[PDB]
Subunit: 385 residues, 4 copies
């Protein structure tokens, strides 16, 4: 059945899950406390193709279906949000943009390593002054003999550090209309330079501790002519496509986190007793479980659908935005109800439910805030009829 794991998926997810429980799960709590970038697990995960999941085998990638890649992200997120974000962003953003707008030359130069894991990718779109209106990037890319002169600063760029390959957006030409500033922007891919690129101090986050998020400062950074990704002044349109893909991944990440929280509360409730009976026998508890279960089930069907469309070469901007919005909002709520079901213990770090919420909370913000996705969704509904 379509909504279930096919025999081909059950053969890739089966062994991937064992690995997750044995090498990722045990150190999840500690990593949330330490915040130490898990280089080991990254190289260890790359083995399953995880870091080149969507890259064609020809380029070294594992050439998997966007559908399969999503289920793996869910699986990773079920045990470690931080890792899930690293994996999802690396593939969806940095790698995805290169594979999407890269020439055969650019692809050959980056994809093999990215898909390998020996080089992590950073996607610089978000800046300090434009957390939502992306097209309003102030980072510049002035034409210079030999290449370009990138001048600007990126903010909250996943893999800001630890990044071997970078993809940065920058305006190279006028909008011209202040409105449509989406035109005039260009994308530039390149390897970690040795001058002109400063990596700000590590940002302390509410959760996803171990994930790498840094500020990027570009002081007169030169990039070869071979850096421009896509058509000059048309990179933002490739950006939107990349995000659509990214959103599918984030949705799966959300579901993973929400499912973990739910499974935990389910088990807890069945055991924990109050007033002479399992707290689960109380509707106040059962209703929360039922609601969460139902919504996460719907969240999953939504990203599976979005992934199915993407693989079919059909439009999915609306469907990816719908999946991300729903999974994110539903997961965070399920996580919050888990905290409530655990009661006083839900408030203590000894248990995972508080981390689940902290990790999942970012899914309603990253790669398009829920508010942003609703406008995206509404615009599509309206332009349709």
């Amino acid at each position: 059945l379509w909504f279930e794991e096919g025999a081909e998926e059950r053969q890739v997810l089966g062994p991937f899950r064992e690995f997750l429980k044995a090498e990722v799960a045990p150190g999840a709590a500690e990593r949330d406390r330490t915040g130490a970038f898990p280089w080991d697990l990254v190289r260890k995960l790359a083995e399953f193709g995880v870091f080149g999941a969507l890259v064609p085998e020809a380029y070294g990638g594992a050439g998997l279906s966007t559908r399969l890649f999503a289920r793996m992200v869910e699986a990773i997120a079920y045990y470690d949000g931080a890792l899930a974000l690293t994996v999802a962003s690396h593939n969806s953003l940095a790698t995805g943009h290169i594979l999407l707008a890269g020439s055969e030359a650019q692809k050959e130069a980056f994809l093999p390593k990215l898909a390998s894991g020996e080089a992590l990718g950073a996607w610089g779109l978000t800046e300090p002054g434009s957390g939502s209106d992306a097209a309003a990037l102030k980072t510049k890319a002035e034409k210079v003999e030999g290449g370009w002169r990138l001048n600007g600063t990126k903010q909250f760029i996943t893999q800001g550090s630890v990044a071997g390959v970078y993809v940065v957006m920058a305006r190279t030409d006028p909008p011209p209309s202040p409105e449509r500033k989406h035109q005039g922007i260009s994308a530039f891919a390149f390897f970690r330079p040795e001058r002109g690129l400063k990596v700000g101090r590590k940002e302390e986050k509410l959760g996803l501790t171990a994930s790498d998020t840094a500020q990027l400062i570009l002081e007169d950074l030169f990039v070869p002519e071979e850096a421009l990704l896509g058509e000059r002044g048309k990179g933002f349109y490739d950006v939107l496509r990349v995000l659509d893909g990214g959103r599918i991944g984030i949705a799966a990440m959300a579901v993973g986190l929400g499912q973990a929280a739910l499974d935990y509360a389910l088990a807890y409730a069945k055991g924990r007793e109050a007033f002479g009976r399992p707290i689960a026998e109380f509707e106040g508890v059962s209703f929360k479980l039922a609601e969460a279960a139902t919504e996460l089930e719907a969240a999953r069907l939504l990203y599976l659908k979005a992934a199915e469309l993407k693989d079919a070469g059909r439009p999915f901007t609306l469907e990816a935005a719908q999946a991300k919005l729903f999974a994110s909002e539903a997961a965070v709520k399920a996580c919050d109800e888990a905290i409530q079901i655990l009661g006083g213990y839900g408030y203590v770090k000894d248990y995972p439910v508080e981390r689940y919420w902290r990790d999942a909370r970012l899914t309603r913000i990253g790669e398009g805030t829920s508010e942003i996705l609703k406008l995206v969704i509404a615009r599509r509904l309206l332009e349709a009829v």
Copy 2:
């Protein structure tokens, strides 16, 4: 393509919807205020075999999948909630119960007429004293020479006054334990008796006005031996199975109504302007549209999944409950938002959104209230911990 309409589905739905737009849509508003049972449309719908949708062609049915049946219910609901309910209940309860537990002789005796729509089916389970706790039925059936004697009252029976075939659940033997009243109940299928069955006045309802609803008073009704449907005292297990199938139909009915409300508000939002601009541009309206569209898509995926599981012969109690719960809640909220988007006009009957809400409101109550469904969902979740 799983989530989209297939070639065989489209072959049926394409012409079916054309018929709905031309023959059903014109008079839905009028039927809502007069409550006049559309015998005309019943016969016309019956030409598409929709009154015996899940019945095998061998028995005069259309032999459709539960997936296609559900999509057709959704299509009808989009234009007329009362008709959708008429179709969904006739098929799922009375007809479905006979198809499920009926011997080959009973199926040959009842299905042909039920399937052709020549005789509508009424399913009498609910009583003035028990709805959610159906197992607490008070109606009784005494084994008499030549058959049985029925005595009791049924409440809120769809098609109660217009049906040619009746399926009634009644107590035949003690629990014997008060904790398990479910055991000891039996079902009886019989044609409209000339004596012994008194129909109460058509009750005034909040919505679904043209849907036939009535109280049934059984006074020493005599039914022959061939009336016993399923094992004596085992009727409740068939009831539960019938309800699982019925909930899929109700979920699709809700999606239909919610989709209609949303599409209406969209059209309105795109045209009606306030403060010098289409009200749709205001995030207050856009957010409502986005949220509703997103939940309805999820709702449809949920019932499709449940239908798929039922057709595969696999368990779907949990999945049918989840579909019905989510669909009804989502649909009702979308209808309430449509009323809000239309503002003052949403409060007047010259427009359909106030009717969409009144019609859909029943979906959160019939065939298992949302509260009942959450318990069903929670219990299933707890048994597979």
Copy 3:
């Protein structure tokens, strides 16, 4: 205590409530179905001075505080939403506007009749082409010799067909910029004219059936020079003030309806039995009752506060908007839950909960939609800081 009914309030409300239970309550169900305007009740209510609640006794009014008037509206709404709306609108809009901006000559000419209930007042602001954007009126007032000429259409006017006194807002002077349209609007108060005013047919509404609502068509209507209410072109500033007073009344109306719904559901749950126990013992029901009671208590405190501010001649735009927004949303939700608690019975008109919801649904739309109020609130909040 402040939040409780004081000595003078109780001396008024004690006998008022006894009157409502015996004279208003018996026929509320019938009025909802027939829509017949209750002239007998209007007259009886008027003997309590309720039709001139806030009008100074010097002008034939009752001279009550806004706090007491609000409690009275709540009391009426508990038994008949239609009547509560009639009382609230008559007092807050037409009467309130004349009381607020009228010269002593106009007050003496109109208030005595309005305050005794001899003449009901209609306030025409909303139009077919504009509701929330009231300043975008199309109705026009032409300065003529001896008075003015009115031409335009008014939509959904309370008491529009039964009013003996009208207050109509019409454009008299062109606004400067296409933004500050709120300037250049004027108000006119006059008795029902023999010619010039055509009342459209009573509109069919979702609820508040017996409430008089009509469209007004003004064709070359001549009003004497004394009809001008307030400074020419400055009428919209009085409108905004009048609306602030109106929202307090509507908030109280909502509390009344929601409280009636909750009280009924409470009574039912205590008596209705399921699974061997009163439905109230199930947290699925108890939670609904608790949340509703809590929000209604909060809603009441909110309108009481705004009324106190108004009585103190203190600014209350923000506070009245908060009360109306919270009360309407809370009351509507409590009514929806009361329907759910009654299950199948909640869907039939033999019981009042379906009427409570239909009646209360208007409170989230009239006098400014919840969306409009949130903007009003957001803006006030942003100014102070």
Copy 4:
């Protein structure tokens, strides 16, 4: 006006707020990271009579009204949630219980030090096994020669490790029916003992880092005859009253935290812009601001109401529970929306909104979970009429 700060209240709050801004606010973020108990602030706060707020001047207290104390708790929670919990618990629980059930000897013995802050109080009710169903305590008190011997474990006890005075609930007599264990419990008040009391082992919390929270291990702890607080075996009844008072404190704590988050998002929104315009100009943002403001105003009115009923010596179990439930749920919601409004910066610890949520999250659990409170409210509503 009632709902506003009166002359006597403003005399205290004006200087108190100046103190909070200057002394408490600057170190809040750091304390959330270190968890270091702020002894200097405790001492400075005590100078305001804050640690003996409800204690009569006769016993060395400040002798303030419950509403003034509540407003002071809200004011503190506005800048430091941990400190608010410290003040609220010390006053409401340990001190409140002694003031309530203590004899003149006991009050004279404990209140002076508690009220001056020279001795902080710990209240031991909750245990690793019984939280919600508190009457199911396992700690035991055995009557010995000239006193009692206590044995048990208390968990999540505020001020548990820094307290100078302890109040512990322990069963001294068997209950007649397990369904009513509320009978047979006793309370014991004593100073920090030399032996018999072992401090738990600091468990890390989601928020309120610097608030002292610890497990208490009682090993054959001896307490004199004069340790028994209240009547033997009737302690739980005083416990229920203590909680009613405590809930008012917690409600105010929630409001303070929510207001802080709202004000922050309010200030941010006004400056920060998106798409070439302040994000507050977007209804997505403005709607959030309006909803939270309205609910917080409602929450504040509810706790002021409960506070006055208690001060008036009237019933307030229902009202304190309503206030605590509403405020806690509303505050946590406002804090989550604040995080959302800040977007990416809402997820970084450099800004306070994430801490506001973490601190506020406990108010929905402590001193009776929202679920427990709803049952309390429902029981009262039902026992009513």
